[PDB]
Curated annotation (Swiss-Prot), chain B:
Record-given protein name: Translocation protein SEC66
Record's subcellular location: Endoplasmic reticulum membrane
Additional comment: Present with 7820 molecules/cell in log phase SD medium.
Gene it is expressed from: SEC66
GO CC list: cell periphery; endoplasmic reticulum; endoplasmic reticulum membrane; rough endoplasmic reticulum membrane; Sec62/Sec63 complex; translocon complex
Cytoplasmic compartment spans: 1-138
Function of the molecule: Acts as a component of the Sec62/63 complex which is involved in SRP-independent post-translational translocation across the endoplasmic reticulum (ER) and functions together with the Sec61 complex and KAR2 in a channel-forming translocon complex. A cycle of assembly and disassembly of Sec62/63 complex from SEC61 may govern the activity of the translocon. SEC66 is required to attach or retain SEC72 in the SEC63 complex. It is essential for growth at elevated temperatures.
Stretch of the intact protein here: 69 to 206 of 206
From Swiss-Prot, chain C:
Any GO BP annotation: post-translational protein targeting to membrane, translocation
Keywords: Endoplasmic reticulum, Membrane, Protein transport, Translocation, Transmembrane, Transmembrane helix, Transport
Superkingdom of origin: Eukaryota
Full protein name: Protein transport protein SSS1
Family according to the record: Belongs to the SecE/SEC61-gamma family.
Region of the whole protein represented: 26 to 80 of 80
Protein localization: Endoplasmic reticulum membrane
Its membrane topology: Single-pass membrane protein
GO cellular component: endoplasmic reticulum; endoplasmic reticulum membrane; nuclear inner membrane; rough endoplasmic reticulum membrane; Sec61 translocon complex; Ssh1 translocon complex; translocon complex
Purpose of the protein: Part of the Sec61 complex, which is the major component of channel-forming translocon complex that mediates protein translocation across the endoplasmic reticulum (ER). The functional states of the translocon complex include co- and post-translational ER import, cotranslational membrane protein integration and retrograde transport of misfolded proteins out of the ER. In the cotranslational pathway, ribosomes synthesizing presecretory proteins are targeted to the translocon by the cytosolic signal recognition particle (SRP) and its ER-localized receptor.
Swiss-Prot record, chain E:
GO MF assignments: guanyl-nucleotide exchange factor activity; protein transmembrane transporter activity
Main subcellular localisation: endoplasmic reticulum
Protein transport as UniProt keyword: yes
Entry keyword annotation includes Protein transport: yes
Any Gene Ontology CC annotation: Sec61 translocon complex
TM spans (from-to): 4-24
Summary of subunit composition and partner proteins: Component of the heterotrimeric Sec61 complex, which is composed of SSH1, SBH1 and SSS1. Presumably three to four Sec61 heterotrimers assemble into an oligomeric ring with a central aqueous pore. In cotranslational ER import, the pore diameter varies from 9-15 A in a ribosome-free resting state to 40-60 A in a functional state when associated with the ribosome. The Sec61 complex is part of a channel-forming translocon complex whose composition seem to change dependent upon different functional states.
Name of the protein: Protein transport protein SBH1
Function statement: Part of the Sec61 complex, which is the major component of a channel-forming translocon complex that mediates protein translocation across the endoplasmic reticulum (ER). The functional states of the translocon complex include co- and post-translational ER import, cotranslational membrane protein integration and retrograde transport of misfolded proteins out of the ER. In the cotranslational pathway, ribosomes synthesizing presecretory proteins are targeted to the translocon by the cytosolic signal recognition particle (SRP) and its ER-localized receptor.
Swiss-Prot record, chain F:
Native species: Saccharomyces cerevisiae (strain ATCC 204508 / S288c)
Listed InterPro entries: TPR-like_helical_dom_sf, TPR_rpt
UniProt GO MF annotations: protein transmembrane transporter activity
Function as written in the Swiss-Prot or TrEMBL entry: Acts as a non-essential component of the Sec62/63 complex which is involved in SRP-independent post-translational translocation across the endoplasmic reticulum (ER) and functions together with the Sec61 complex and KAR2 in a channel-forming translocon complex. A cycle of assembly and disassembly of Sec62/63 complex from SEC61 may govern the activity of the translocon.
Name of this chain's protein: Translocation protein SEC72
Location(s), subcellular: Cytoplasm
Source taxon at top rank: Eukaryota
Keyword Cytoplasm: yes
Amino acid sequence: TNYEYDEASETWPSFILTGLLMVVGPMTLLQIYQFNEEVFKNLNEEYTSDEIKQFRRKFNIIIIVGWILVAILLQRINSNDAQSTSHGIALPRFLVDGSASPLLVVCYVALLGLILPYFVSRWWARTQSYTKKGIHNVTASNFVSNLVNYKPSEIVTTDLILHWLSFAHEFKQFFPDLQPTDFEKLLQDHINRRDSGKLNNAKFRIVAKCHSLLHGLLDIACGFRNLDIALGAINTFKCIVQAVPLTPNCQILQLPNVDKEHFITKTGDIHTLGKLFTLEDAKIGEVLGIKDQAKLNETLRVASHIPNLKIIKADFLVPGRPYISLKVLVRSAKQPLIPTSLIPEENLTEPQDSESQRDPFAMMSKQPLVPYSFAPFFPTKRRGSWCCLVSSQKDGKILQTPIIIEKLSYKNLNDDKDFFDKRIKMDLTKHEKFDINDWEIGTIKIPLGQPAPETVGDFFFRVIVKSTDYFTTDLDITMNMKVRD
Amino acid sequence: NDAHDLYFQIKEMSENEKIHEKVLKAALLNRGAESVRRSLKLKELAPQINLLYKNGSIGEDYWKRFETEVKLIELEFKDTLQEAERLQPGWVQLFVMVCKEICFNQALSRRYQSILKRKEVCIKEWELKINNDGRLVN
Amino acid sequence: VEFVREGTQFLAKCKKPDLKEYTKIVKAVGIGFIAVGIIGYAIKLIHIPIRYVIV
Amino acid sequence: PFESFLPEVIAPERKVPYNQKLIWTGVSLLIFLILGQIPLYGIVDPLYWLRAMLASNRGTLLELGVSPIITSSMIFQFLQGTQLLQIRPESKQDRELFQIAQKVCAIILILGQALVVVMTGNYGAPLPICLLLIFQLMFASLIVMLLDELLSKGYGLGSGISLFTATNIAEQIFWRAFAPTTVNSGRGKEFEGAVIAFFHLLAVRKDKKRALVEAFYRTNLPNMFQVLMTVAIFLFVLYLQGFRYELPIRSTKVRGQIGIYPIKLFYTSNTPIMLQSALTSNIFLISQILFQKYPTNPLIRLIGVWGIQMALSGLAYYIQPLMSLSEALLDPIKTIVYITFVLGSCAVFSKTWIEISGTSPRDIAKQFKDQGMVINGKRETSIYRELKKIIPTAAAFGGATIGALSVGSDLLGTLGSGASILMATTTIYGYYEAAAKEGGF
Amino acid sequence: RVDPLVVLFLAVGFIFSVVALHVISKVAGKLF
Amino acid sequence: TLEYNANSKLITASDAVVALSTETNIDQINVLTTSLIGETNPNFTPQPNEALSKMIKGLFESGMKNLQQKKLNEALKNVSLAIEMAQRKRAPWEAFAIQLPELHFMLRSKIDLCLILGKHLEALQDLDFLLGTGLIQPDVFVRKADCLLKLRQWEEARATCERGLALAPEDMKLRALLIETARNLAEYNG
């Protein structure tokens, strides 16, 4: 029908009052109604450069305002003095018949002709250009076009993967002024621990974005069933995370403060962590050349915490879809080797329940997260990771995407069991503090992702578990499935 | 990154410089070999690109670009065969097999030639110290 | 009287939801229904003064 | 089969994620709903039932609504049920021809219906305005049909008809609750919304012991007690959604696949209630028409007599729904016959729909033999006998429960019809369970 | 053939055209 | 660009800096025309040549005779010359299944000779090429693991030993090599 507006402020005050109360009340009631040790999150901030700190730093009132405005409106209502039916509306009169007769209509016409379609178009263009992995489309096109015409002759090194990475498209929108050669030179300056001079705020950004690009390259390489480029990708990612060039003796140059001109020239037989720890405590400082107790303690405490893995038991499992089961023992570089026989065999076995039978990965989904890494030259803070990829043994081709596990228990590294050292050589397993139920055993499960062959016989497989933030010891074992039916 | 326009460049230079006649057949065989190699490469790469597409990690444009390249390569091969027929009368039933062999043979030749360059990469990457006679001197 | 007997048997054979599932279902249904209804109400309200003014 | 080159929206090659689907659903709904408020330009037989069921309102661009689309789909569904089109799934060209025939007959149906309404409607006979007015409706129906096709291709959470119906139901429920309009009849200006008038009387009257008893009952306009009844029935029907039967199943062609087949209680809730409502609306229409046209006749008086308008002492009198408890206690046999009719109707409608739509226990058994799935703890030759002991009883009990909830809502006098509420809840729970079984934000 | 943004632009153009026709027909009588 | 020589009939790139693909294609065309100059028949056949194969066999026998004379220094040079000739002066359009096996058989003897003499890196690279070009048998993995351990690459040593055991696990040498590489790696860590 034909309504009549309130021109004497008789109804719209209560209208606004209830409209505010119905959204305030829920807010008030909602407001009144309301594991894994990490020791690098404190030590990292002391060895990071100051410019990196500057970079990393650089790049409820609604309830009370609603209550007070409700109070004002309530007082305004209380201050007012206040057979055919006359229809009426609650909106005031000057909103429809005053001097603002074209204002409201032009504002609505604007909100219908400009803001909606333009914003929808921008959002569509922003969410249609990105691939599911989280990278641009031109970058994925470039990576596939580079893997297609790739001769088997050229041996994959770090430089070739850097040369592929400096062709990414996400590096153009960041700095439309630079060129691919500038990006390659910047990444070289980062890896060699060299200074950019003026483009530091660009080098840091491109290095920070390098992670997702390397993960995209790894996934597509595993897609094409090409192993060597995936291995190169993981190695280059280690290199960029740790800021060290890839050479034979790198496990010892990943340390915080070691001098190359002294270490390379004096000794040439120390190549890894165990061979290092075999020496005495003063000999380590003497060979590394830092001669500072207050600083030697820090380097020992960081070199005694980067996790090396080891296999205990691994075998197939045959549900409707097979999935591999791994039993690894995460240890540090100091604990001596403990045999497999003393393991009580209880933790290794799996309890058979309906909930566990339905989804066996539920138990793995419970273990804690991994701590923050030790990346004194990576801009942000990164968590450790573990990238596991499976390969066949008949021809040597990757046959599934890399499953990137994240959860693992690093408890066996804590400073509680320091009595278990290798330099004592006194058969330390028979100690009073040794508890065979105290050593925790992580567990990693990889879905096989492919149906079992219908033939009957032996079939070889091979699983790799490489680290992605340190230069520690990894896994490379060959297991075979004995299909018998 | 192709040896197609090189044949046309050689033809244009022959139109004026009076080069010998066998060089034209040589360039034609080269073009044919490249065509057959790319045909095999596409035929053997189709399924994995299809899988990466259906997984939803490549986008939509490259799939169509690939499908177009599939037939562009065949069209190029047919035009090359026509040019070969124009070059010599009754020379099509043997050209296909000659091309099929030269492709594989030069592939092996390149893979073998690569080792002289490949040999020093490992030296640089592992910091070896090798004197003459290829022995180790620690 | 056999039909209600079979009905009771079937309901005893069915599964009644617990609290942790009931609360999630009711939260989802409530938020969806409210998000539809509020839009309907606001679009029915705003078009009264404009349809009055332009016509 | 013939040649056809007409516009149609393309389906995506890959599965679209949850957010790009939800945003499209929301924006399509916003466009469809704005298309329902704007009045025509050429303006200068009221069917409340059809316009309430078909999501249409007079005096706006959306006066036709989804009626031509739904009637074309129903015509082709009936023709496919009668085995006349002999549609065979062995060919895709036949399916393309059928789906393009749907649209090329829908458009001419829109043209015919619009010509009819412009020739008979109350707009007026007095040509440029006529062509403009027919073009307006043509364009509006074309846009709504494209929106339907888009949301049905896969870009949206589901179809369009059910979503629009749920939208209208929820909008009407909220408008009957937070209405800002007022009426002045002797006493003064009173809000037509329950909570609005409740808070207004709590604020300005300052006589609480009388204001509460005046605003809580409100024998003349909607009150808060009806809102309480609505939210109570809402929670009840939502709790009634989880009732389902689960039997364990296993595979035989491929070993190691153990699962559970669910059999819910609300099997085919949607169709029978809207069918029976359409039949009652049509019967009331025809009875009013015959009573208006003919003064008195034996059969005219027997089929129904209208009085104070409402039917009285006739066959149409019995089928009318009850208003309150007063009429219930007045004539018990009338309540009895009405309840039995409404229950038997939904029961038989559920039965015929589960027999026609292809969800018969024999069909499920044949589908299981196709998939090779077998009961976990039972043999193969007994699966059909087991479905015979579950499916019909479950369907009948579900239909009876829907009828009971509807009659209870109608007797309690809720803000909206119980059928509308249950449809809204079941259709949105469909989306919820789809998102749950699929997995998304 | 047609993309979703095409349909949305068609709808927006239709609605804005009807509203503009109304406002022009109204102002025609008010100015003269 | 490109300049055409007159008497040599060799196309040379007269530009200053050219990509690698252009160089490779130009060399291939040079070899093709050099072979077509000698081949006189218009309808050349994939049938292999005879005199070239005879010369190859003669050089191979001249090299192998030094082993009977126990001359371990010149036999390698002779086999290298024979391989170079068989690779160079053989027309590319000849049959594949006859040019591949001769190269493989000669290269295997060359690998054995180079490993016995005392050169290691060349042996490892030859083994890798021979294994990559499509021949996988336990007669290769043992020598590859030997060369790897000789020039101190331990992780790859265990890797190749395991791949080798993954094909003929009944061997008696792969297990000894696995034991030795496990011991060396345990020393390399411990």
